[PDB]
Amino acid sequence: KTAEYEKYANYMNYLYYYQNNELKKIDSSYFKDKYLGLFFGASWCKYCVTFIDSLNIFKKNFPNVEIIYIPFDRTYQEYQSFLKNTNFYALPFDNYLYICKKYQIKNLPSFMLITPNNNILVKDAAQLIKTDEYINNLKSLIKNYIIHPKTFQFNNRFFDLFRNLEHH
């Protein structure tokens, strides 16, 4: 149990990103108390690639929402090229079907907005960000959202977000 739970306490302790052809990492603690935008995608997914343009517009208007790529690339080579092209933070290249199942994600691309306490602010944020009324409406939604304190298992926000049992 000890070895397994030490791994859980350390689960997702780094997120990754590219910077001038160089793979970098950041402590997951940086994301504590931040709104997140979870982008489920893959290099081989035509409309995931075009969706990058929508995410760039989103980041311009919501710079403090941290975009995290949840990858479904076929190869690590595609994963690296996707990170280099988008400059998004990303989960390490791995199998994330379990995240799809937990959130009932039906297809790619998908985009979900997550509150600092791991609630779903907008489930289908890919459709939210299609037309221009979203900008002021989302500013209002974030401004008005009341964040009630939540303690996460292992004090690990990503373990709670991706590994809690509440979907059952």
What's the burial of 61, exposed, middle or buried (CB within 10 Å: 0-12/13-18/19+)? middle
Cβ 12 vs Cβ 75: under 8 Å: no
Q: Is the residue at 88 inside a domain?
A: yes
CA-CA distance, 144 to 73, in Å (whole number)?
A: 36
Q: Is the residue at 8 inside a domain?
A: no
Residue 13, number of CB atoms within 10 A of its CB = 13
Q: Is the residue at 154 inside a domain?
A: yes
Q: Residues 6 or more apart from 22 whose CB is under 8 A from it?
A: none
Question: What is the CA angle 69-106-116, rounded to 5?
Answer: 45
CA-CA distance, 33 to 96, in Å (whole number)?
A: 23
In CATH, what number is assigned to the domain containing residue 89?
A: 3.40.30.10
Question: What is the CA angle 80-81-86, rounded to 5?
Answer: 100
The domain tally of the chain equals 1
Q: Is the residue at 90 inside a domain?
A: yes
Q: Is the residue at 2 inside a domain?
A: no
Q: Is the residue at 46 inside a domain?
A: yes
Q: Is the residue at 5 inside a domain?
A: no
Task: Transcribe the chain into DSSP letters.
Answer: -HHHHHHHHTTT-EEEEEETTEEEEEEGGGGTT--EEEEEE-TT-HHHHHHHHHHHHHHHH-TTSEEEEEE--SSHHHHHHHHHHH--EEPPSS--HHHHHHTT--SSSEEEEE-TTS-EEES-HHHHTTSTHHHHHHHHHHHH------PPGGG-HHHHHHH-STT-
Q: Give the position of tokens 């791995």.
A: 94
The torsion angles phi and psi of 64, rounded to 5 degrees, stand at -90, -10
User: Whose CA is closest to 99, among 167, 148, 45?
Assistant: 167
Q: Is the residue at 7 inside a domain?
A: no
- The whole domain housing 38 covers 15-163
